[PDB]
Design a protein around this ligand. Structure first.
Ligand SMILES: CCOC(=O)c1cc(=O)oc2cc(O)ccc12
Lengths: 100, 86, 135
């Protein structure tokens, strides 16, 4: 079963999917192919919690009906000592026009 | 194979290449990074969410859910979608 | 041209609304005129008595947005009941945006800050008669 994710670090945001049965380390292999960083220099997070390499995305709370295509779940990324988990927020939308 | 779509505020969105080829405009601006001077991150992130949404539910039999658009981003997303023809 | 065939052969149909919209069923009579039927709340179904060769299309009852039935625009009851699976289509991002903006701004359309061609897109509401000439 597919889960749809946003892997985010600093001002980087990767849109990808993975199997619910796939492991955290296997996600780091996906990140490795894109950002060219080995998994040992990678740290994956759900919100603030550090994720274990051997656990599957489903055990980590990334389920199909919470990681939707039109609303993907966020996986925090941190590079290596290790930096602190930093995710730059998106820009703020303007005020609603008077006609809305 | 991936491509980078950079918003106006520096945010870098890395999506699959075939997802970005959905928009005919983005294919032209690639023919591999693309900068969007007029699309902020709170609009381009929604655009990338639509790429996954379109590819997943096109030619699909399971019930299709509504693509959610907050009111505060509807006007900007409309101009971006009109420009990108997506 | 787009009209129902007066075959007088009954065909039992189940209108199945698998969409978050209020579905307005539209029967095309023997002169091509669109005839509206009672609406279906989201997720609700209805057993209707139609006929073979008859033409049905379904829209959003409030906004007349186009909807799919069995992954197509037109639904024709055949020989027996036949399931009429009404679902949302994969709207383009532009049309989906027009839908949301239309639902928030009163047809104050010109007061928005957009290009002039976007005002005409907002005013060009989805309409059954316009789509009939298209098909
Ligand atoms: C009124 C401020 O909003 C914009 O100017 C704008 C926002 C956006 O997200 O995408 C655009 C695409 C365009 O081609 C032209 C303009 C925009």
């Amino acid at each position: 079963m597919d889960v749809f994710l946003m892997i985010r670090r600093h001002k980087t945001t990767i849109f990808t999917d993975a199997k619910e049965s796939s492991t955290v380390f296997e996600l780091k292999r996906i990140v490795e192919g894109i950002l060219k960083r080995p998994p040992d220099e990678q740290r994956l997070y759900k919100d603030d919690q550090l994720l274990d390499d051997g656990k599957t995305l489903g055990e980590c709370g990334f389920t199909s009906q919470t990681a939707r295509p039109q609303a993907p779940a966020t996986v925090g990324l941190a590079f290596r000592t290790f930096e602190a988990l930093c995710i730059e927020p998106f820009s703020s939308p303007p005020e609603l026009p008077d006609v809305m | 194979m991936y491509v980078k779509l950079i918003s106006s505020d520096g945010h870098e969105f890395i999506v699959k290449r075939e997802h970005a080829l959905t928009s005919g405009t983005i294919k032209a601006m690639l023919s591999n990074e693309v900068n969007f001077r007029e699309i902020p991150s709170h609009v381009l992130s929604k655009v990338c969410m639509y790429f996954t949404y379109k590819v997943r539910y096109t030619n699909s039999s399971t019930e299709i859910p509504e693509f959610p658009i907050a009111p505060e981003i509807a006007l900007e997303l409309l101009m971006a979608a009109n420009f990108l023809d997506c | 041209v787009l009209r129902s065939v007066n075959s007088r052969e009954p065909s039992q149909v189940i209108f199945c609304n698998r969409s978050p919209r209020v579905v307005l069923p539209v029967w095309l009579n023997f002169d091509g005129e669109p005839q509206p039927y009672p609406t279906l709340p989201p997720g609700t179904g209805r057993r209707i008595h139609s006929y073979r060769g008859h033409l049905w299309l379904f829209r959003d009852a409030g906004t007349h947005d186009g909807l799919l039935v069995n992954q197509t625009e037109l639904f024709v009851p055949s020989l027996n009941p036949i399931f009429a699976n009404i679902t949302l289509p994969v709207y383009t991002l532009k049309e989906r945006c027009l839908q949301v903006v239309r639902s928030l701004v009163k047809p104050n359309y010109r007061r928005l800050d957009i290009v002039r061609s976007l005002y005409e897109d907002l005013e060009d509401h989805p309409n059954v008669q316009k789509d009939l000439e298209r098909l």
